[PDB]
Amino acid sequence: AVVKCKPTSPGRRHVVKVVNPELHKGKPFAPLLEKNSKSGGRNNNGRITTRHIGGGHKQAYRIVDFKRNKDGIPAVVERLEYDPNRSANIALVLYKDGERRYILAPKGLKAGDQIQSGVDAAIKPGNTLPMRNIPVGSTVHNVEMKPGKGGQLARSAGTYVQIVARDGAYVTLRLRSGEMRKVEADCRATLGEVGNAEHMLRVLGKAGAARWRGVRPTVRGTAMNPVDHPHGGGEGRNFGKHPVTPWGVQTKGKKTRSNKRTDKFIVRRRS
Amino acid sequence: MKRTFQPSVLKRNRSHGFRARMATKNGRQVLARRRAKGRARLTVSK
Amino acid sequence: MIREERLLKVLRAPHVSEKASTAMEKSNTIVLKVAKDATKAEIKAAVQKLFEVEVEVVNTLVVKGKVKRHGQRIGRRSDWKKAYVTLKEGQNL
RNA sequence: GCUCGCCGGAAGACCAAGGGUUCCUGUCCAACGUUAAUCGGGGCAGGGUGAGUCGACCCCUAAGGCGAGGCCGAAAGGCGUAGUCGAUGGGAAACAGGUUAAUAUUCCUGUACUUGGUGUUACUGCGAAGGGGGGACGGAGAAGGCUAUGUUGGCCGGGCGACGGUUGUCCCGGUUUAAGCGUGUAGGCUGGUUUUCCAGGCAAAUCCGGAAAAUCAAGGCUGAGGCGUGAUGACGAGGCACUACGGUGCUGAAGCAACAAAUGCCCUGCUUCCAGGAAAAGCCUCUAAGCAUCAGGUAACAUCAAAUCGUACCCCAAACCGACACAGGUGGUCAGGUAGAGAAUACCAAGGCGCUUGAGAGAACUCGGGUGAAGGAACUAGGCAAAAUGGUGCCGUAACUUCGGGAGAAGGCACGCUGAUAUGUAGGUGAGGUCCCUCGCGGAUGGAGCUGAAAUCAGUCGAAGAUACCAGCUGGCUGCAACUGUUUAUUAAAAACACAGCACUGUGCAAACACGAAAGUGGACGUAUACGGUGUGACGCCUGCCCGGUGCCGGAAGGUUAAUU
RNA sequence: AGGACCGAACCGACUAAUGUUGAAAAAUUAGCGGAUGACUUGUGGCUGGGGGUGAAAGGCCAAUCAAACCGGGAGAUAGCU
Numbered sequence A: 001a002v003v004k005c006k007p008t009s010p011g012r013r014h015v016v017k018v019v020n021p022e023l024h025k026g027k028p029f030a031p032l033l034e035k036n037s038k039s040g041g042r043n044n045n046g047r048i049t050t051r052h053i054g055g056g057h058k059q060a061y062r063i064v065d066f067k068r069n070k071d072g073i074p075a076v077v078e079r080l081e082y083d084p085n086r087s088a089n090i091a092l093v094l095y096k097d098g099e100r101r102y103i104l105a106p107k108g109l110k111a112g113d114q115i116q117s118g119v120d121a122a123i124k125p126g127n128t129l130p131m132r133n134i135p136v137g138s139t140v141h142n143v144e145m146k147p148g149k150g151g152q153l154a155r156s157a158g159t160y161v162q163i164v165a166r167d168g169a170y171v172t173l174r175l176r177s178g179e180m181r182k183v184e185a186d187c188r189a190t191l192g193e194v195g196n197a198e199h200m201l202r203v204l205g206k207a208g209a210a211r212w213r214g215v216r217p218t219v220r221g222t223a224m225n226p227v228d229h230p231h232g233g234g235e236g237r238n239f240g241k242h243p244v245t246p247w248g249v250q251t252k253g254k255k256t257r258s259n260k261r262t263d264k265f266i267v268r269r270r271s
Numbered sequence B: 001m002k003r004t005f006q007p008s009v010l011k012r013n014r015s016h017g018f019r020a021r022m023a024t025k026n027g028r029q030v031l032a033r034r035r036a037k038g039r040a041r042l043t044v045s046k
Numbered sequence C: 001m002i003r004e005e006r007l008l009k010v011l012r013a014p015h016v017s018e019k020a021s022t023a024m025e026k027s028n029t030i031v032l033k034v035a036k037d038a039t040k041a042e043i044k045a046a047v048q049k050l051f052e053v054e055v056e057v058v059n060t061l062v063v064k065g066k067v068k069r070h071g072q073r074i075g076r077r078s079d080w081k082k083a084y085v086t087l088k089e090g091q092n093l
Numbered sequence D: 001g002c003u004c005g006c007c008g009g010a011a012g013a014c015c016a017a018g019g020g021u022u023c024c025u026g027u028c029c030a031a032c033g034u035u036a037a038u039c040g041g042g043g044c045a046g047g048g049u050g051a052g053u054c055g056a057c058c059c060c061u062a063a064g065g066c067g068a069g070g071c072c073g074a075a076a077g078g079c080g081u082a083g084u085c086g087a088u089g090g091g092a093a094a095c096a097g098g099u100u101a102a103u104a105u106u107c108c109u110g111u112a113c114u115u116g117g118u119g120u121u122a123c124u125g126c127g128a129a130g131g132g133g134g135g136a137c138g139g140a141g142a143a144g145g146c147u148a149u150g151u152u153g154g155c156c157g158g159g160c161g162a163c164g165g166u167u168g169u170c171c172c173g174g175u176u177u178a179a180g181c182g183u184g185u186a187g188g189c190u191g192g193u194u195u196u197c198c199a200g201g202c203a204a205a206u207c208c209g210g211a212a213a214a215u216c217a218a219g220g221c222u223g224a225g226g227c228g229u230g231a232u233g234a235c236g237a238g239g240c241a242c243u244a245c246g247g248u249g250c251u252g253a254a255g256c257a258a259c260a261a262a263u264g265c266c267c268u269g270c271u272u273c274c275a276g277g278a279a280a281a282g283c284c285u286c287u288a289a290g291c292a293u294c295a296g297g298u299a300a301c302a303u304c305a306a307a308u309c310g311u312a313c314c315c316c317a318a319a320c321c322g323a324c325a326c327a328g329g330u331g332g333u334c335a336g337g338u339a340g341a342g343a344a345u346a347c348c349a350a351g352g353c354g355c356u357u358g359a360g361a362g363a364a365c366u367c368g369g370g371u372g373a374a375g376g377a378a379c380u381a382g383g384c385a386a387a388a389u390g391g392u393g394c395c396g397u398a399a400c401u402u403c404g405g406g407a408g409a410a411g412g413c414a415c416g417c418u419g420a421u422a423u424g425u426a427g428g429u430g431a432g433g434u435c436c437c438u439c440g441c442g443g444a445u446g447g448a449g450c451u452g453a454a455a456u457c458a459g460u461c462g463a464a465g466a467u468a469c470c471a472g473c474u475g476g477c478u479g480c481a482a483c484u485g486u487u488u489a490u491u492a493a494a495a496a497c498a499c500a501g502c503a504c505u506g507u508g509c510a511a512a513c514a515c516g517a518a519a520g521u522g523g524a525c526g527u528a529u530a531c532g533g534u535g536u537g538a539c540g541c542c543u544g545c546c547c548g549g550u551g552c553c554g555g556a557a558g559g560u561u562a563a564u565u
Numbered sequence E: 001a002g003g004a005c006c007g008a009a010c011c012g013a014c015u016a017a018u019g020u021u022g023a024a025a026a027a028u029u030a031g032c033g034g035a036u037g038a039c040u041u042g043u044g045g046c047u048g049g050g051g052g053u054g055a056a057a058g059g060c061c062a063a064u065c066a067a068a069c070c071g072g073g074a075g076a077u078a079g080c081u
């Protein structure tokens, strides 16, 4: 559900919120919860290594099963849940032997639905199979890059991967970026799209809403002095130079990928 | 107004105390310099 | 059991003041100066063995030595321990 | 000592931090104290800090620190594993009265509570470094039940008034009591019990999770406050006998109800929202190795233990941070009366103070204020400053608008006191009595007593009734920035910065990028609906032409071209 | 409901006067802005000098900042006074 707030105050005028009625209103499953304090973008030297990070709401980490390696035990979806740590929603599933787990909730999945993993799983959304057993043309998500490592590709809200080809031991995947990549056919994938496709229709509306998510203000380079940015300086608004990062690398079109180890797997760049 | 010195005994001992000096070779060199000068008070400890 | 040598060492002096005398009268309590490291149990055992009276409780405090200016030089008297020894209402030490 | 004045959400009281004897007593007045000093936070001397329950220490962890081995690095060293530290957080237990010149939840009196070690008895499956439950957690809002507390009445004791009245519907004062134990309430959550089974909880489990049936329909957990006991005790206004005038001591009445009522408690509750809200131990439970009539566990009684350290005093300040006995700064708690929406404000209570130079005079001028004829911005860079407006209820309110606003637009009327309605109304609170039952801190009825707005009418005083304190000036046109925010600590608060939104661009995850000779770390326990960089800056309508120059992206025929040979 | 409204505590600092060998090496008085939030505050911790940190003023990093402080090279050099 996408609903616009009424302009009863200037900070509310442009707010557009995503409210999902189905989401659980209670507390999360306690044994599947771990704490994680914030870093502020600071590394173990105590230096800011990533700017514009800090503050925001306290969050508990939910242990999500990206591996999906209970083969042959059917599971039932108990309830959808809000996960602060990611854009997608998650589903708390109960296994027939009494094990409870969190999974990425695919589009369409709801309470009472059955899911299953393994080679003999039925082709239906939320089921996990090796891509050997998944037909060419299927839409999948939570794609493994190595067998047994856990899904790593297409995990954000509303994303998915298209299985384009299958030759030998490798499948050709079409990624959200447009890149065509090769991954091993033993790698597991989950049928269907990631849910919460309406997540991109949100409008924060005010600066405080970005602050609630741990995002600190960005200061433009041209607004500062030359001592601390190549864009700095000037009597009035002056630029006269090719745009660069704070460290001097050109930031409009220059390419930065340098990985000859994984170049063999890239069928075509995203263009 | 609020001034620069705002005393805390715990912070004082953790910053300049005897154990803090002993924990690094540079602090041990501070202690050697102060012993060689003949200082009655080596650190802020007491 | 605490050793006899320790008991002979712990007790130092009886404290003489009007508060101590009021303790002796009102509450049958003697006030002593003891060693800085003399515990309550050692004080009780030493009073019983060395003053031959029955004790039911001792109370202790540490007195901080004062700072005194003697000939413009700065000095500090030593800290000492003081004991309030209650005799169990039948002794009259 | 008697008056006077000042603070009283503090200028009173208690703490933490910080200080360290400044605390109390005697004595002294050189120096110190912005003057004197007989006085002092000054000199000198003596005295003073009493704990199983308060805190530390202790058990347990957060951020973070250190870190055996380890990985890395010319050396020095960096990071990090197992671990081990680290509160600002979790974890056993005490209250009231009395007492010193100076301590007291520590001493004394009374009445309690916690944990541990032993000893005996009786029953008996005990046991972890492991499994599980629990601890255990956000913001906002609403209502009910309470209590602290206050007011009035009743009750007790005392009074009969320096000037007209004051035996009464008069005046003054008191009317207090804890923890614990018993009760299990207003209320909150949740269906129980019993069989059998199981791809789960690293092994196991009767424990937790799941599955299938029977049976019953009330069980369990939590819970302020009240009541009873504690307590025939203590305290108590006042009386009495001495005084060192400070006080010593004896006795000591009544000690009830109603009403109002928190920002405190029930409540870590309930409702709701999105930004989705510590950890670990104590604690309960389950077993494994193991022991296996032993040990150990449980229940009762006895008895012993609870150490050490802190404890004086200041603590919005003359004792801390400011070189000062300095108009500065400094976290938490307590929270009376009248009026008031109020922790504003005025006047007061408890309590605390008059700020460590005074005495005169009554010039100019300076500072801070009061009032002002006639005029009313003529002043000036500029209405700077000042003057003015100011409350509640009701009526009434334009352009424009993103339909929310604009708006308290503007403007206007009423406003005190007395009586009546109504010997106190509508409402709120609620006793006695009666009726019922799964019988009590129960249900229903009944409404005495108490408390008590708003309105209308009539009358009445003053120049003036939101009378003091307190408490919006309003309107028209226009530049800039959408807006709330941020900034040059100490001459600039803005049109500057940020901002939601927009766009370009990079990035396929051992991501790009950043900090690092490195190992690693952040990005992120994220995965293109993501993350970084850059510019623009809500929203509406839009965003034209140029790739010659510079940059970037792509291409590789040809020219040129390094080490090398 | 709200980076909603009026307004104390609390956080700030727009105007004026005083003060300028100050009561004060940045305050006082009267007015002024925010006041449930991008709020404010206590305790503890981390980031170190061509480095940090910065809603960006070359601001801030112990009354010191277009390169902190302390010690050292060091009696730097000074065609200048």
Ligand SMILES: [Mg+2]
Residues within 6 Å of the ligand: A051, A052, A218
């Ligand atoms: Mg960024």
Ligand SMILES: [Mg+2]
Residues within 6 Å of the ligand: A218
């Ligand atoms: Mg931005």
Ligand SMILES: [Mg+2]
Residues within 6 Å of the ligand: A223, A224, A225
């Ligand atoms: Mg600038």
Ligand SMILES: [Mg+2]
Residues within 6 Å of the ligand: A226, A227, A229, A230
């Ligand atoms: Mg440059």
Ligand SMILES: [Mg+2]
Residues within 6 Å of the ligand: A235, A236, A237
């Ligand atoms: Mg220009």
Ligand SMILES: [Mg+2]
Residues within 6 Å of the ligand: A240
């Ligand atoms: Mg130009």
Ligand SMILES: [Mg+2]
Residues within 6 Å of the ligand: none
């Ligand atoms: Mg002294």
Ligand SMILES: [Mg+2]
Residues within 6 Å of the ligand: none
């Ligand atoms: Mg004194």
Ligand SMILES: [Mg+2]
Residues within 6 Å of the ligand: none
């Ligand atoms: Mg004299």
Ligand SMILES: [Mg+2]
Residues within 6 Å of the ligand: none
């Ligand atoms: Mg003098």
Ligand SMILES: [Mg+2]
Residues within 6 Å of the ligand: D042
């Ligand atoms: Mg003195």
Ligand SMILES: [Mg+2]
Residues within 6 Å of the ligand: C060, C061, D051
């Ligand atoms: Mg003690």
Ligand SMILES: [Mg+2]
Residues within 6 Å of the ligand: C057
């Ligand atoms: Mg005792």
Ligand SMILES: [Mg+2]
Residues within 6 Å of the ligand: none
């Ligand atoms: Mg840690």
Ligand SMILES: [Mg+2]
Residues within 6 Å of the ligand: none
């Ligand atoms: Mg080592």
Ligand SMILES: [Mg+2]
Residues within 6 Å of the ligand: D067, D079, D080
């Ligand atoms: Mg380390």
